[PDB]
Structure formats: structure tokens, C-alpha cells
Amino acid sequence: FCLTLQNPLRKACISIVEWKPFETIILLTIFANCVALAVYLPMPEDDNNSLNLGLEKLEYFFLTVFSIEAAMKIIAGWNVLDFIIVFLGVFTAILEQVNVVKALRAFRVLRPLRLVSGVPSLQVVLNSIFKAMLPLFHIALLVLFMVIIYAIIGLELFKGKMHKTCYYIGTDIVATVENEKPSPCARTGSGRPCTINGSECRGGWPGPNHGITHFDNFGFSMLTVYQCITMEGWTDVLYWVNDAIGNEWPWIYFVTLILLGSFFILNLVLGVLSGEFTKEREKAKSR
Amino acid sequence: MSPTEAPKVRVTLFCILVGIVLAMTAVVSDHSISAAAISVFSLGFLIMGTICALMAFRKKRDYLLRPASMFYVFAGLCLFVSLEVMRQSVKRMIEYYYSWSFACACAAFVLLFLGGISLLLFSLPRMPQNPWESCMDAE
Amino acid sequence: FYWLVILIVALNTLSIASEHHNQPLWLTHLQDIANRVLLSLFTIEMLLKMYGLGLRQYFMSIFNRFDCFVVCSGILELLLVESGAMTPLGISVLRCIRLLRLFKITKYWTSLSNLVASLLNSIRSIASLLLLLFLFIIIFALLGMQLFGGRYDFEDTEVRRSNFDNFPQALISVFQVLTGEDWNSVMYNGIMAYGGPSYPGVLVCIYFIILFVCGNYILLNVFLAIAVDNLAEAESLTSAVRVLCHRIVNATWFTNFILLFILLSSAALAAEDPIRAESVRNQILGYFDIAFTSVFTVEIVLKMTTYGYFNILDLLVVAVSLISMVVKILRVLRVLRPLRAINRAKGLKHVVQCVFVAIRTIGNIVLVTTLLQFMFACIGVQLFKGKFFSCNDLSKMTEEECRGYYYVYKDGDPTQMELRPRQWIHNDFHFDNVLSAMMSLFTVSTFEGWPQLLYRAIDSNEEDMGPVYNNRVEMAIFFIIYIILIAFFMMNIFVGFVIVTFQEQGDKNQRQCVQYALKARPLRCYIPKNPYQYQVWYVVTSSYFEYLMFALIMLNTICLGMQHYHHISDILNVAFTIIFTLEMILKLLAFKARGYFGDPWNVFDFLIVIGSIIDVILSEIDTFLSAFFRLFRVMRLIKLLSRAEGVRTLLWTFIKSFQALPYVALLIVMLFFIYAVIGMQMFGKIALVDGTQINRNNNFQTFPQAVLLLFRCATGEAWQEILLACSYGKLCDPESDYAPGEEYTCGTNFAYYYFISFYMLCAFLIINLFVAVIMDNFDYLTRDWSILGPHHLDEFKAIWAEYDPEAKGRIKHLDVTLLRRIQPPLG
Ligand SMILES: CCCCCCCCCCCCCCCCCC(=O)OC[C@H](COP(=O)([O-])OCC[N+](C)(C)C)OC(=O)CCCCCCCCCCCCCCCCC
Ligand SMILES: CCCCCCCCCCCCCCCCCC(=O)OC[C@H](COP(=O)(O)OCCN)OC(=O)CCCCCCCCCCCCCCCCC
Numbered sequence A: 001f002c003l004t005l006q007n008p009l010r011k012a013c014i015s016i017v018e019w020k021p022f023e024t025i026i027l028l029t030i031f032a033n034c035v036a037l038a039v040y041l042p043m044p045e046d047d048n049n050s051l052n053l054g055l056e057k058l059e060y061f062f063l064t065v066f067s068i069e070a071a072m073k074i075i076a077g078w079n080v081l082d083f084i085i086v087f088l089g090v091f092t093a094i095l096e097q098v099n100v101v102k103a104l105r106a107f108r109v110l111r112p113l114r115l116v117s118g119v120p121s122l123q124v125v126l127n128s129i130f131k132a133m134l135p136l137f138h139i140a141l142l143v144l145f146m147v148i149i150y151a152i153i154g155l156e157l158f159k160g161k162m163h164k165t166c167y168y169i170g171t172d173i174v175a176t177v178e179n180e181k182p183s184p185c186a187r188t189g190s191g192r193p194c195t196i197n198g199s200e201c202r203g204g205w206p207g208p209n210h211g212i213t214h215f216d217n218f219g220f221s222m223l224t225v226y227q228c229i230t231m232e233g234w235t236d237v238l239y240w241v242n243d244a245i246g247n248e249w250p251w252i253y254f255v256t257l258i259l260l261g262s263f264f265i266l267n268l269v270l271g272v273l274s275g276e277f278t279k280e281r282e283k284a285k286s287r
Numbered sequence B: 001m002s003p004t005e006a007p008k009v010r011v012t013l014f015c016i017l018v019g020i021v022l023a024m025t026a027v028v029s030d031h032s033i034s035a036a037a038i039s040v041f042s043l044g045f046l047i048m049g050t051i052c053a054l055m056a057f058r059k060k061r062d063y064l065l066r067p068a069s070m071f072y073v074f075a076g077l078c079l080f081v082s083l084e085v086m087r088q089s090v091k092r093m094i095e096y097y098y099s100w101s102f103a104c105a106c107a108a109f110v111l112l113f114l115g116g117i118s119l120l121l122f123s124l125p126r127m128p129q130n131p132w133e134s135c136m137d138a139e
Numbered sequence C: 001f002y003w004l005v006i007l008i009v010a011l012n013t014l015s016i017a018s019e020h021h022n023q024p025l026w027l028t029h030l031q032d033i034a035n036r037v038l039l040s041l042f043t044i045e046m047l048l049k050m051y052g053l054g055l056r057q058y059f060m061s062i063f064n065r066f067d068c069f070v071v072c073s074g075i076l077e078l079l080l081v082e083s084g085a086m087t088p089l090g091i092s093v094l095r096c097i098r099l100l101r102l103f104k105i106t107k108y109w110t111s112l113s114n115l116v117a118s119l120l121n122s123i124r125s126i127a128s129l130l131l132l133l134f135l136f137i138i139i140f141a142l143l144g145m146q147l148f149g150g151r152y153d154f155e156d157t158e159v160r161r162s163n164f165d166n167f168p169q170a171l172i173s174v175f176q177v178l179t180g181e182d183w184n185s186v187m188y189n190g191i192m193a194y195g196g197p198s199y200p201g202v203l204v205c206i207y208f209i210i211l212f213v214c215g216n217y218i219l220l221n222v223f224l225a226i227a228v229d230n231l232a233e234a235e236s237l238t239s240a241v242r243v244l245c246h247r248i249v250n251a252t253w254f255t256n257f258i259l260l261f262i263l264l265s266s267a268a269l270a271a272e273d274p275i276r277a278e279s280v281r282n283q284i285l286g287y288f289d290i291a292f293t294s295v296f297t298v299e300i301v302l303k304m305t306t307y308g309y310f311n312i313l314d315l316l317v318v319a320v321s322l323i324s325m326v327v328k329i330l331r332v333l334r335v336l337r338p339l340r341a342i343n344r345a346k347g348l349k350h351v352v353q354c355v356f357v358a359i360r361t362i363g364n365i366v367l368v369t370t371l372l373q374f375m376f377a378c379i380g381v382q383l384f385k386g387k388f389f390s391c392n393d394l395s396k397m398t399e400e401e402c403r404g405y406y407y408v409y410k411d412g413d414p415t416q417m418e419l420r421p422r423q424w425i426h427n428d429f430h431f432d433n434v435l436s437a438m439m440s441l442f443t444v445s446t447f448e449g450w451p452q453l454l455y456r457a458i459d460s461n462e463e464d465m466g467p468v469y470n471n472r473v474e475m476a477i478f479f480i481i482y483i484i485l486i487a488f489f490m491m492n493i494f495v496g497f498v499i500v501t502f503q504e505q506g507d508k509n510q511r512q513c514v515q516y517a518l519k520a521r522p523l524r525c526y527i528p529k530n531p532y533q534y535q536v537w538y539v540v541t542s543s544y545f546e547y548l549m550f551a552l553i554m555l556n557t558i559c560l561g562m563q564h565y566h567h568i569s570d571i572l573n574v575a576f577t578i579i580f581t582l583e584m585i586l587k588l589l590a591f592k593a594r595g596y597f598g599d600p601w602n603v604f605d606f607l608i609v610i611g612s613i614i615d616v617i618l619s620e621i622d623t624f625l626s627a628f629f630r631l632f633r634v635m636r637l638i639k640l641l642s643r644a645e646g647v648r649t650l651l652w653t654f655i656k657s658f659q660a661l662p663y664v665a666l667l668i669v670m671l672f673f674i675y676a677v678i679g680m681q682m683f684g685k686i687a688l689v690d691g692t693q694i695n696r697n698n699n700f701q702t703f704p705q706a707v708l709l710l711f712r713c714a715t716g717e718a719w720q721e722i723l724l725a726c727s728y729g730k731l732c733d734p735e736s737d738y739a740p741g742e743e744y745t746c747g748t749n750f751a752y753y754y755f756i757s758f759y760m761l762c763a764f765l766i767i768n769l770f771v772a773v774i775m776d777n778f779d780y781l782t783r784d785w786s787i788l789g790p791h792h793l794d795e796f797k798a799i800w801a802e803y804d805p806e807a808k809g810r811i812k813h814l815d816v817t818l819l820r821r822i823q824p825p826l827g
């Protein structure tokens, strides 16, 4: 307090409303501007209706009001974020006119953060959340190391198996029954041989989920491991590997992965969270 | 005495020696080409294990029970490999079955392996289960 | 007066829960007149208590404040419906608001009112955090509308309802990704919406990873701060010549043998094939069962010769074997041997009793949770009654039109068609009656298959017509308000109930250091003499050598990750094996195997070394002329936690507590074993047809496949699809027995009682095992790292042996010189 830090009192003249109800107008404008982003309707590959062309105009009004607010607040922690928002906004607004940009319109969705930065009773809650995110550090490191180990294991064992499925003979149409998904196949091995009547198992196939779930390289393997850790569609990978390379050896990598994602992750996380909440109860009560 | 003459470790070693003799049988009882190198390697592992597993009793050199088990373990872990290279050879070189040789090998693998793991866990000092205990402590 | 009002309240609840689709006319004629007479009697009682309690006694009593509301609302609805009231959805919502009157039974119930007060206190405490969560959801919905808005311009005909076209749909998709249901299907659409599995396209897979890792972290911070900070406050404030065998029957011989005599008698049902009951193995299993029942009837008669709770259990399990000799029910009720082990090991006794008292503690919270479900079920029946029908082709909107055959186009190719007969199919999970509605809400509460009901309720047309594409987009509010309460709130406070009780059933610094003071001991360091080898010993234990090994391990990991698909992985591995064998030999030469096989981590190091060497040898043989033997190279990084001071300790803590309750983990194993055999017997002959949920990988044919199916249903996969894949009408596989004509008789509706129950019990059990551990380590979970902790004393222990080579009791008083190294928290 009791500082100018820019220039003498001749400059800080407009700082008379900062103690007026100014915490209810720029907040009202931020809530009117977060509603001008919900009614925007995105259309496929460069189409537009009238309402979007009107919102493109209204964006200028909103940017200018926020810039003049920052201009009446500059001469007088979260204001850092507010200035970053205004900077990105004016950058976008001038770039979209230099051409006469999607990556420059994607940052327009940070505006609602000014709403949390407005009310002070919410920043204490956000700070509590951030402070409680700390004691989970060892658990986070353990989960990262386990995901890495399992990704490397899967990358070693199942590197390039799920690349065969029976097409039709003399055809590039994968052969499946009505409700089946395109699971892998294997001919003259352990893997499942298929029985679609006009079908043959031949290689050159991207992958089960259009090539997204497989163990080819480290990236997709880590992705599949992370997806199995969340217990969503882990039986799908288990089956895609339990019917394309064997049936009695690939059940261990998955079941174990679950028991190391179900037991340990939930137990450790809930334990440390309940412990921190107990310490919070004690530091709030013993006073 | 405590890790060398307790009943559990004693009966486990009594089981693993039977595992070794059945491994010898399954090696000789014959009932693709690398199936012999893995086997002689497992045999050398059994020898290298029993060398330090016999001398672990005397001189109170008990700590050598820790490496010995591993060798036994690896012995089993080697034999299993040969096991597969037999099975695959059947799918490589009609009706087949698994006579004396394969059944004795499938028994010896489990016996040697589980006995070696149990011997390792019986020789390893302790899980603390108390805030003041620790591994590698005096008696 | 309590019974006087409970009679009419129960009668009104019955008139509510009596409604269903296609009810006879007389049922409606009964329900409407019952509503009328009960509204008039509610008026009579309201006016009686008004004339008997004074005018200024019905507008401040919250407990009976909204009975005037009830009667006035009933009158308003009567007079609005008696006139011309179009929009049958209007009648539906007017009867939805009618369902409020059943809350007098909750209000007069004092304990229920106390629970309402507790819950309202909790929610008024967490309103701000809930608002922050809602704002985060909105921000991510907007970011999704930016990224994938209108980018589902797919040229094919598969429907993708969980897209980001407008704001309500973006909110629905973000909520679905948040609750973790089918979120991996909303990610593949977002990936293929960009290029594909290419470099710039897969990078959109990090919008769904931040939304599920940090969107479920906040969600746990909210609904677990309501149960340690406002639910715990409720309890806190509440606080302020027959002796020839009598000799061994108590000896360890008889007991320890009759214990192991069951674990192999239970395995008589495991090794069984249920497709054909008579083969070359079932005879052997019956022959073994002869002994497995004789050696136990001998036991029970050896018990009866001495004497005259659990003994009757053993008696029944041994009496069913005599009648082993309808016919399919006795065979099912014969796996009872695993139960009668609680009175033998005396380890299951305590866990069974503790869980049977934990069930006792929980009762007033589960009552209201099952009422809320029953409540919502009635609202659903009012909303979606009979609107869940749909023809086979979406172009026919009535059961009169949905006949004949129609064309199905493969791959959306208008030149590759097939004929299929259309049929008016009733959806699997529907809302016709309160039973079916309660079933559907039960499946929704477990989050499995809730979007497929959401996009069916959204499309609901009238009361007996086909689904219209996005007809009602405001129908998702009912599926979002129920998933935010019962499936989110109630469950999180029900777990808080248990957690808080564990703490109660489960100053303090002085109660651990005393044990650490007298029960501890000096430490070993193995400082060697004979400087000849002390030379290499000083660098072997030096810090920069361990830093070098850290770096080499990380380099090995990076070289192990570099591999891809379609000769630099064969030689660098040999180099790394050589360097690590060098490390092994060196540390073996500076410890003479005396201090090498003392530390368990070097015990593990030697294992890794020998395994990697054998792997290199086998690879050499491979190249000259065992896939799992390569796993020993990835194990090399597990020793990275030799320096993990705060992670190895956490693993120690949470591992030494899974060895203190091996019996709570025996309950789950017994549950799986008891349910797998019942499954194998009941539904074991269903044909394995691909495209259905009972296929070559998910079936009850063998025992391991049954256990894997049970594990899948436990961990929370599509269990409600299996539940419909094994219910009375599937094809029996040919290797079974059936007369020509009796082929479509596999499965049975008993499945509904089989799976539901299994999802309750298992869940319950998975709670206990998860909290029995959490309560076991409330020391470590709540440890102030500044006042005093066994970390300080372990540091002191390690500093003690720094000057003291062996134990040798205490040391000379000069090493006071080490007291200058301890910290003020200790000195
Ligand atoms: C800090 C990290 C903490 C977490 C890490 C701790 C756990 C480490 C992860 C566990 C290892 C994963 C299991 C191995 C996967 C084997 C499956 C498989 O091989 O299938 C395909 C492979 C396919 O190989 P294949 O030879 O069948 O291929 C085809 C063969 N022909 C040509 C005949 C068709 O199956 C096999 O490798 C056969 C071997 C069967 C068993 C081998 C696996 C043994 C693994 C030992 C378990 C380790 C104990 C876990 C440690 C404790 C952790 C709780
Ligand atoms: C604030 C709250 C929490 C915040 C968490 C933030 C997590 C962010 C996730 C980061 C994801 C990785 C980011 C870098 C991706 C780089 C992708 C790349 O470089 O190449 C693409 C990759 C492999 O190459 P690709 O392009 O597919 O080649 C094909 C032909 N050219 O192909 C790929 O598909 C690679 C994609 C792999 C992504 C896997 C990420 C999963 C990691 C799971 C760990 C989460 C555990 C949470 C622990 C916290 C504890 C509470």
C-alpha cells in the first residue's frame, strides 16, 4: 500500500470507481460473454449462419470492454491471467483481420476463468484444491512408473500381432457377423481361426479400433495401458489379444494390470485423501 | 538354525531335491534342436545351485541359501522353455499325446519353481509389519 | 395417530406404484377415485389439525409446512385436468408433482428428519466447491465444442449420438466422459474426426485424458469432503467311555487335517464340465466325491459320539451328500463345503462378525437410498411409460406398420443390400412398470449402459410409437439429476458412514516412540577391514557410482522404449547386460557375498543379472539357428526405487497391511468360487455364437472362463448385456442333450437374481477390503511430519551404525560426537 509504482498522482486519476460496485459489472459482463459462447453454433468445415456472424461482431464489443477495464485498472496474481486473456484476445482479433485461426479461437474459452477470479469466496476453494493436490505426489509417481512398466511389457510381448483379419477371398472387405467388431485373426498358429464361409485370414490390416488400440510402438501401447487402467474396455483388448496370439498366456498381463490399477491406485489415493481431510478436520477444530 | 533348521525350510528343500531327481528322470526318460542346450544349461544351473546349497548348512554360511534358490528357480524356468519347444515341435514335426516324459517335466517344473520361490521367501529375513523393524537386521 | 396416517399414506403409495402400461380400464377407474378420496381425506385431516392446533401453527412448522402445498396442488391438478388439458406430457408432469405427498412418512420419522438436516448441512457447506466443479464442466464443454464441433463429418452411416454439435449435447458428452462410461468411444470419434492415427491427429487424445484425470480428481475432492468434514461432524457432535477320540478331536492333527480335507473337496466341482454330465472325467470326480463325503460323515459321527451353530451347518453339508444319490436343484445346492470353514480356521470368524456388524451400522442411510430409487422409478414410469418401443427400420412408427421385409444396406453402399424381416421390438431395459423402472435405474446407478438409455429416452415419441430423432433434449435432465444424487451423493455419504465409523472403532506421539524406544535394536552396516578391498569398497558405496547406475538404468529404459514395428536392439542390450554384470561382480568383490546377500535389493539384482544373461544366451542361440525371458530387461527399472525415499515407504506401508487381513481377501475368493460353480451349472450349455455377449472368450463352459466372466462383471464391464445374453431362449450348443424341438431352452430368468445379487455382494465386499486397509494404516495416513515420527527415529538408527560397525550393545560415550548430528525434533 501507499505506492504509485508507475508515476505520480497526476496519472492515477480514473481510479475512483475501483471501490464502487465494479465487482458486479465486469462480472456481469463476463457472465453475459460466457453466454455469447454457448449460443455459438459450430458448422462443418467453414459454414456459417447469421447468429455466428453477429457473435463475431459482439466479440469486438466484449474485447474492447475488457481492454478498457484493464486500462482503468493498470493505473491504480489473477490479473496476470486476465492480461494473458486480453493479450490472446487482441492477438486473435488482429490476426483475423490481417488476412483481409482456429488455434487462436480455441483460447477464447478461458474467459469463464475471470468469473472464478472475480468472487473471492471461490478462490479460497480453488486454493484448497491445489494445496490438497500436493500429498498425492508419491502416488502419482508410482502410477506413472507402473503405467510405464506395463506399456514396455506390452510393447515387448504383443508388438505387431493384431494385424490380421479374415477378409473375403479376393476382396478387401473385413468379414464380420452382424453385431461383431473387427477382432484380429490368425491362421496356422494358436490364434482363433475364423469361420465366415468366404473368408481368408491375410495380413496388412491397420488395427482393431481403426488402428488406435494396438501395441505397435510406445505411444499406442501407453495409450492402451492407460485405457485399461481406467477399467473401460479392458476386456476388449484382452479379447483382441486372447484370440489373435493364443488364449492361455495373455490373461496375466491384463488381470494383473487391473489388480494393480483397481486395488493399489484406489486404495492409495482414497487413503491419502482421507488422511489429508482428517488433518484438515483437526486443524479446523482444534482452533 | 532359524532359517536352516526350521521345519518349513527343511521340508521345502526336501521337496526341491525330489524336484531335481525328477528333472534328471525327465531329462533321461525319453517317452527342436535347441531342446538340448536349454536342458544342459538347466542341469548346470542345478549343479551350481546345489554346490552352494549344500555348503550353506556347514560353517554357518547360511546367507548362501539366497543365491542357491535362484539357480533352482532358473533351472525350472529353463526346463519350462524346453517344455514349450517340445509342444511346438509337435505342432511342427495324426494324433499325439504327452507320455511319461512330458508329464514328469510338467510336474518337475512346478515343483522346482514353487519350491525355489518358497525357499527364497523363507530365507529372506522378514516382512517388518511394524514401524521399528527392517530387512537386513541382526538375528 | 401414527398408524391413522400411515394407513392412508401407504394406500396412496400403493395407488402410485400400481400404475403400468396397458393397465385395464378398472385399474384407472380405481386409481383416479382413490386419488380423489385420498385428497379429500387429506383435506379432512389438514382441517382437523388446523382447527385443533391454531392458525399460527401450520406456517412455521417445517415438518408439516407443505401439507397445505399437497392439498392445494392436488386441487389445482384436479381442476386443470378436468378441463381441456392437451399435451399428455402435461398430464404426466401433473401426476409427477403428485408424488410429493408420500413424504409425510419420512417427516414423521424423526431419524429421517435428522438425516435430512445432516445432508442439507453437508450440501450447504459444499455448494461453492460444487459450483466450481460445474464451472469446470462448462469450460470443458466449450473447449469440446471448439475442437470437435461439427467435425464429425463422417461419410458413413453409423450413428454417433455423443458428439459436440451444440451446447446441450456437448454438456451431455462431457458428463459422460466425466462419469467414465464409454468414454473410450467418444475418444475414437474425436481421433478419427481429425486425420486418424497419425502424428497431429492422436494429439487430441489428451483432451480426454485431462478431462478424466483432473475432472475425476475434483469430483473426488468434492464428494469426499462431504464425508470427512460434515458427515464426521454429525458423529462428532453426537459424541459430545466316549474319550477314545476326545483326545485328538481337540489336537492340531485332527483339525489341521479336516481343514485341508475341504480345500481339495471343493476342487471336486471346479474340475467339472457341465455341457455333458457323463464323460470320462465326471465319473472320476464322483468317485472322489464318495471319499470326500465318507471322510466327513466319519468326522461328524466322531463329533456326535462325544457331544449331543456351525455344527448344524456341517451336518447339513454332509447330509446333502447322502441324498446326492427336483433333480437340478439338489445338484446346485451341494456346493456348501467352502462355507463350513469359518468355525475351523478361527480366522474367518472375526471378519464375518465384523462385517455382520458393519451391515448393522449401515441401515438408516440405505433405507432412504432405496426409497429415492423407488421414488425416481415412479417418476420414470410417469414419463417414459411405453415410449421405449421401436420398429426394426426407423421409418415405421407403429406396430401396425412394422411388418413385412425391408432392406439393410452394408457399409452404407446402396448397391449391396439384404432382406431382413422387420419386427416391433420392445427395448431390453424399459420403464413400463416400477419393477422394470427400478431395474433400469439400478443399471443406470452403476454407470454401465446409461448413455444407451439416455439417447433412447431423448428420442421417445408419444406413448406407443417409434423413436423420433432427438425429440426431447430436455429428457437428459432426469438422467443427470439422478446420477448426480443417488449415483453420486448418497453413495459417497454411504461410504463416508463406513469410513467415519472405522475411525471411531479403530496423546498419540508418546504411544509409538515408547515401542520404538524399547523394542528397537542397533543396525548393520558391514564396514570392511583389509584396505586391499576397502579400496574398491569406498567407490562401490560412493554416491556418484549410484548416480551413474541411475543414469544407466534410465538409458536402458529409453533404449527399450525406442523399439517399434516394421539391428540396434540386439547389441545395446548385450552392452547393458555386460555393464550390469560388471556392477554385480564388483559389488560382490567389495562385500565377499557377506554384505551382498544381506540386502534384499542385491538379492533381486542377482536374479535380474542371471535372467538377463540367460536371455542373451538364448538370443545368441536364436541367431545361431521363450518370449517371456525378455521380461528380465524391463524388470531392471524396478530397482529405480532403491532411492525412492517416499515411495518405497508407501509401498511398505500399504503392503504390510494386505498381510494383516488375508481373510477379508478370503471372503472374496469364497464368493467367486461359490458363484462360479452356480454359474457353470445354471447357464453352462448356452451356445458360443459370435456377435453375442456369450462367445468364445466370455462363457461359463470351463471354470476359469466362469471366473473371468465374474471378474469382468465385478470390475464393472457391460454386465447388463451378459445378463440379457443368458436368459431363457438362447440356443443350446449341440454337444448338450435336447430332444429335436427342445433346442431353444438354454438359460433361465434366474439370471436376473444371479447377476444383480453378485453386483451387490461383490461391491459390498470390495468396500470392506478397501476400508479394512484404510483403517489399518490411519497411523501413516494421518502423520504430522514435523512434530515426531518414526522417520526421525529411523534416521537416528541409521546414523547410529555409521560409527558402530556391529551391534556390540551401546558404544563408548565419545560417540556424544554423533549427538551433534541428530535434529532438534529428537535432540
Ligand atoms: C514399479 C512397478 C510396479 C508394477 C510392476 C510389478 C508387476 C510387473 C508386471 C507383471 C508382469 C506381467 C505378466 C507377464 C505377461 C505374460 C503374458 C504373456 O506372455 O502372453 C503372451 C506370450 C506369448 O508367447 P508365446 O510363446 O505363447 O507366443 C506364441 C508361441 N507359439 C509360437 C507357440 C504360438 O505368452 C508367453 O510369454 C508364454 C509364457 C506364459 C507365462 C509367462 C509369463 C510369466 C510372468 C511372470 C509373472 C510376474 C509376477 C508379477 C510380479 C508381481 C506384481 C504383482
Ligand atoms: C492437471 C490434471 C492432470 C493432468 C494430466 C495431463 C496428462 C497429459 C497427457 C500427455 C499425453 C502425451 C503428450 C505428448 C503426446 C505426443 C504424441 C507424439 O509425439 O506422437 C504420436 C504418438 C506416437 O507417434 P504417432 O504420431 O502415433 O506415429 C504414427 C505415425 N506417424 O501416438 C500417440 O498416440 C501418443 C499418445 C500417448 C498418450 C498417452 C498418455 C497417457 C498417460 C497416462 C498417465 C496418466 C496418469 C495420471 C497420474 C496422476 C495421478 C493422479
Ligand SMILES: CCCCCCCCCCCCCCCCCC(=O)OC[C@H](COP(=O)(O)OCCN)OC(=O)CCCCCCCCCCCCCCCCC
Pocket (backbone or CB within 6 Å): A140, A141, A144, A148, A217, A218, A219, A222, C554, C557, C558, C561, C562, C563, C564
Ligand atoms: C509428477 C510426474 C507427472 C508426469 C507428467 C507427464 C504426464 C504425461 C506423460 C505422457 C508421456 C507420453 C509421451 C509419448 C511419447 C511417444 C513416442 C512416440 O510417439 O513414438 C515412439 C518413438 C518411435 O515410434 P515411431 O514414431 O513409430 O518411430 C518411427 C516412426 N514410426 O520412439 C520414442 O519416442 C521412444 C521414446 C519414449 C521412451 C521413453 C522410455 C521411458 C522414459 C521415462 C524415464 C523416466 C520418466 C520421466 C521422469 C518423470 C519424473 C519427474
Ligand SMILES: CCCCCCCCCCCCCCCCCC(=O)OC[C@H](COP(=O)(O)OCCN)OC(=O)CCCCCCCCCCCCCCCCC
Pocket (backbone or CB within 6 Å): A247, A248, A251, A255, C658, C665, C668, C669, C670, C672, C673, C702, C704, C705, C707, C708, C711
Ligand atoms: C492380496 C489379496 C488379493 C485379493 C484378490 C481379490 C479377488 C481377485 C480374484 C480375481 C482373479 C480372476 C481369475 C482370472 C484367471 C482365470 C483364468 C482365465 O481367465 O483364463 C482362461 C483360460 C481358458 O482357456 P481354455 O482352457 O482354452 O478354454 C477353452 C478351451 N480351449 O485359462 C486357460 O486355459 C489356462 C489355464 C488357466 C488356469 C490357471 C489359473 C487359475 C485359474 C483359477 C483362478 C482362481 C480361481 C479361484 C477364485 C480366485 C478369485 C479369488
Ligand SMILES: [Ca+2]
Pocket (backbone or CB within 6 Å): A231, A232, A233, C181, C182, C448, C716, C717, C718
Ligand atoms: Ca463400461
